[model samples]
Target: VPQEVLNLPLEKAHEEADDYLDHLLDSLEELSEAHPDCIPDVELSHGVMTLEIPAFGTYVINKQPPNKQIWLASPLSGPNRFDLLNGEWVSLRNGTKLTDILTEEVEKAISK
Candidate 1:
């Protein structure tokens, strides 16, 4: 079954969106897990959902599937962003400074 697409609020789009999206990914992954051969593709479409970006940062639950195009990795330094679709991490292109992507805790971790 195709998961319903509901974008995050405008104020939480940039940073908070990660968690929400991650949860969405989790839901999709769960569906895929239950019915592997039933559904095969999942994408984040703009019009399908609203992405509300916020300035304040938040901690996210970093999740990783055993072998799939699903992940819950957030950025920490250099370029605070990644690409989960291509199974390759890429720099955020002309991006929004995501608080979840780069947080104070991550800063301390990277410094060490």
Candidate 2:
């Protein structure tokens, strides 16, 4: 079935979303696992990925399938919602991919 709100067909949307989400999750997990000192402590549980920094606060990334969007609660940028558009998870207002924003936030958090 097509999601009228998302303006995309549900099945295909899910398939692509899964691929992108899983890939991003793996990248985050690997980044944290590989660099214990450089990256902050990370917890991947349930449907959320949490980054815990000693001095800095926590940052969260999670999937919101109901809206067909990736939700981010960033310490640096506050909250953001991104929906898949033209094969990339782009923000509703501004066109920015989830990974792009996360990478910046992750780097900033780790550096601070």
Candidate 3:
């Protein structure tokens, strides 16, 4: 990974990663707890978070600190990568916010 691609300082990057991961895990847990039939298991280990949904298979989100990126393995949308940009973690290829992508993907996963 190219360090030049990262715009935030090391400390800021770590902080932002922590904040985003915290928010994401909280949101997923809330959603899962609110709908037991839809989401079965939520697990977090080290830098990886995994959600097991009844109709959605498994979704994984992990942190990549060295690159200052967050990676998602969505059951519905396949794999996606995001990097911090302009204070928001944005998809390098699609320009989608991390939350926005998860929102849409999770909706699709459940609706199917």
Candidate 4:
């Protein structure tokens, strides 16, 4: 399933990326409301989501069309690339779920 998703055509890849990114943006908005102090800003535009955490730093999650991958730049974890796999976004390099990384890091940052 992972390989299949990774092999999707360019158009399908764009669709998948857009859907996931949109959902992620919604989750970020909810997180901002839940942790208003730490999450000061959350914005999504042009297939990219940018989240600001005043005490920590910024998180940038964007789609890479050529690679058909989702890229994450985080204050805690630095950078990682994720591919659509089995209905989830996962890092091929380390078997880490994109959602898991975001959730864990956000918790850590807010508790600091």
Q: Model 1, 7-107: lDDT tens per residue?
A: 53335344334455655555544554433343333445541221111221222333233332123333223323434434333335533333334334333
Per-candidate TM vs. native?
Answer: 0.24, 0.68, 0.76, 0.79
Per-residue lDDT for 63 in model 3? 81
Error of 2 at 36 (Å): 5.5
Native-vs-model 3 lDDT?
0.77
Tens-place lDDT per residue, model 2, 1-112, is: 6467576554533455556667776777678754547565767676677777544577787877644477778776888887877778887658788778877767775566
Query: Would you list the rank order by TM-score, best first?
Result: 4, 3, 2, 1
Which order, best to worst by lDDT? 4, 3, 2, 1
Q: What shift in Å separates residue 82 of candidate 2 from its native position after superposition?
A: 0.8
CA lDDT, candidate 2, residue 18: 58
lDDT of each: 0.36, 0.71, 0.77, 0.81
- Model 1's TM-score against the true structure: 0.24
Which ranges in model 1 have alpha carbons more than 4 Å from their true place? Answer: 1-14, 43-112
Enumerate residue pairs that collide in model 1. Answer: 7-49, 7-50, 9-52, 10-52, 12-52, 13-52, 13-53, 14-53
Estimate, for each residue in 1-112, the C-alpha lDDT of model 3 and write its tens digit: 8867566554533556667887777877778755637877778887789988757688898887545478888887788888877888888778888788878767765566
Candidate number of the best TM-score: 4
Candidate 2 minimal-lDDT segment of 10 residues: 8-17
* Deviation in Å, model 3, residue 68 alpha carbon: 5.8
lDDT of 2: 0.71
